[PDB]
Amino acid sequence: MKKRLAYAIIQFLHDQLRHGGLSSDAQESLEVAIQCLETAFGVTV
Amino acid sequence: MKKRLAYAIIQFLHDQLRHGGLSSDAQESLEVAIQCLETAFGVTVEDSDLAL
Ligand SMILES: [Cl-]
Questions:
Q1: B27-36 contacts: CB < 8 A, separation 24 or more?
Q2: Which CATH architecture group holds A1-45?
Q3: Which of A9, A31, B33, B50 makes a 20 to 30 Å CA pair with A45?
Q4: B48 to chain A, minimum CA–CA distance in Å?
Q5: Record: contact B27-A36, CB cut-off 8 A
Q6: Cα–Cα distance between B45 and B36 in angstroms, integer?
Q7: Does the domain at residues B1-52 carry the CATH identifier 1.20.5.420?
Q8: With an 8 Å Cβ cutoff, is B32 touching chain A?
Q9: Touching check for B11 and chain A: CB below 8 Å?
Q10: C-alpha distances in angstroms, B3 versus B6, B36, B41?
């Protein structure tokens, strides 16, 4: 498992929610993706 | 998010699903995360019929 790269991506995606200015529909899917990724890689932000 | 980066990210995740040594639970979560990112960022890698 490439844990550090996955963790970097998880941090980046969290930031997209807070500073990324995405659309509502993209935000809904992204929120789900982040929850799933934290389970997949065993690391949270 | 830049489309090029989104694509690279999803490709990395697909590779982790096949080679990351994740638990069964983690693999399922990863498969769903892929669906979600494809929808969120408007690019496809795995293209599952399951993606909503
Ligand atoms: Cl496959």
A1: B27/A40, B29/A36, B29/A37, B29/A39, B29/A40, B30/A36, B30/A37, B30/A40, B32/A32, B32/A36, B33/A32, B33/A33, B33/A36, B33/A37, B33/A40, B34/B10, B36/A29, B36/A30, B36/A32, B36/A33, B36/A36
A2: Up-down Bundle (1.20)
A3: B50
A4: 15
A5: no
A6: 12
A7: yes
A8: yes
A9: no
A10: 5, 15, 7
Q: Rounded to whole angstroms, how far apart are CA atoms A13 and B47?
A: 21
Method of determination is: X-ray
Residue type, A1: M
| Structural tokens at position B14 | 């697909």
Contact A1, B21 (CB under 8 A): yes
Q: Please state, in angstroms and rounded to a whole number, the distance separating the CA atoms of residues B47 and B50.
A: 8
Nearest by CB to B21, from A1, A32, A39: name it: A1
Any idea how long chain A is? 45
